[PDB]
Chains A and B, each alone.
With several copies, the nearest count.
Chain A
Amino acid sequence: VQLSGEEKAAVLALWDKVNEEEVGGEALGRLLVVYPWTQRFFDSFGDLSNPGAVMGNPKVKAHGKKVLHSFGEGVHHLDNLKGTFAALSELHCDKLHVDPENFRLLGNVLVVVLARHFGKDFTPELQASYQKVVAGVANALAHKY
């Protein structure tokens, strides 16, 4: 979970350009559409029956923003992820019982959403750096297992 000096700078420069509203909602929405079993954890969000209802769901957009804000904490605290996600790890293990494999999936979907928004500016080396970040966040979130 270590980046070079140029890697972390490059990662942050792209994060400054992230729309904190759309990206979070789209990533979570794609998770519920592409991995439908995840919908089980969000029965209280309402209609998730078709991509239209999921991608336009106001609760999905709101919760997605929260999720992206937490990924942001990971991008800015790489050297202390295990401590940054202690409470969230406990939440997802004891209370929600989310399998750690799903953290990886949401992490890759987020990467795919970033690629869709930034196009050729999301270079392979820049993605490689975000694969490291996404893996670190996923590992920190599964520490309570």
Chain B
Amino acid sequence: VLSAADKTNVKAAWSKVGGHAGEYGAEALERMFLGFPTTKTYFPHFDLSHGSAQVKAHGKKVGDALTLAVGHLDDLPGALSNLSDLHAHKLRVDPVNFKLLSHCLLSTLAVHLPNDFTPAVHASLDKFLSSVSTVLTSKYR
């Protein structure tokens, strides 16, 4: 599914993210909640207001999980197993919402990394986020 070129594109792109993975995760969440309000249904216990500390905290965990995935491109099912259990079994997140967050993530990267967000990197990050979504929405136990 992911070619070797995609893996190296994702690897290099995420090296540009560097220590900002949490900030970008948080901003992506903020863009998703405002742009697709249905997604707020999955966080009824969150303070979703402007500057919310909960969103910032959750974004850090989303960013950290993606960094982990970037380091296990060759075995995402095994590396993300615990996260698949939470999202597919416990939380039963509609797969549609993963397309929305992926789009909001790419938007965030486009804002902060305009010179590095080339079409090819764009295309490889899209494949990457799609493969991560498939793992997190699947019951493969």
Residues of A within 8 A of B (CB): 29-30, 33-34, 36-37, 39-40, 51, 54-55, 97, 99, 101-102, 108, 111-113, 115-117, 119-120, 122, 124-125, 127-128, 131
Residues of B within 8 A of A116 (CB): 110-111, 114, 117
Q: How large is the interface on B (under 10, 10 to 19, 20 to 34, 35 or more residues)?
A: 35 or more
- Residues on A with beta carbons closer than 8 Å to the beta carbon of B123: 33-34, 51
Contact yes or no, A37 B106, CB < 8 A? no
Instruction: Name B41's contact: one of A29, A39, A54, A97 (CB within 8 Å).
Output: A97
**Leading 3 A-B pairs by shortest Cβ distance:** A116-B110, A128-B34, A115-B110
Number of A-B contacts (CB under 8 A): 80
Contacts of A111 in B (CB 8 A): 103, 107
**Cβ of B83 < 8 Å from any Cβ of A?**
no
Residue pairs across A and B with Cβ atoms less than 8 A apart, 17 shown, are A30-B122, A33-B122, A34-B123, A36-B139, A37-B95, A51-B118, A99-B96, A101-B94, A101-B96, A112-B103, A112-B106, A112-B122, A120-B111, A124-B50, A127-B34, A128-B31, A128-B34
Q: How would you classify the secondary structure of chain B's contact residues: helix, strand, loop or mixed?
A: helix
Interface residues of B in 85-141 (CB under 8 A from A): 88-89, 92-97, 103, 106-108, 110-112, 114, 117-120, 122-123, 126, 137, 139
| Contact assessment for A115 and B111 in the assembled complex, using a CB-CB cutoff below 8 Å | yes
**Chain B nearest Cβ from A3, distance in angstroms:** 13
Contact B119 A119 (CB under 8 A): no
Contacts of B19 in A (CB 8 A): none
- Interface SS majority for chain A: helix
Are B137 and A37 closer than 8 Å at their CB atoms?
Answer: yes
Please state if A131 and B36 are interface contacts (CB–CB under 8 Å). yes
**Distance A119 CA – B27 CA, assembled complex (angstroms):** 13
Complex interface: chain B residues within 8 A of A40 (CB): 92, 94
Kindly list 7 other residue pairs between chains A and B, CB separation below 8 angstroms, not including A30-B119, A101-B96, A102-B94: A36-B139, A37-B88, A97-B38, A112-B106, A115-B110, A115-B111, A128-B34
Q: In the complex, what's the smallest C-beta–C-beta distance from B121 to chain A, in angstroms?
A: 10
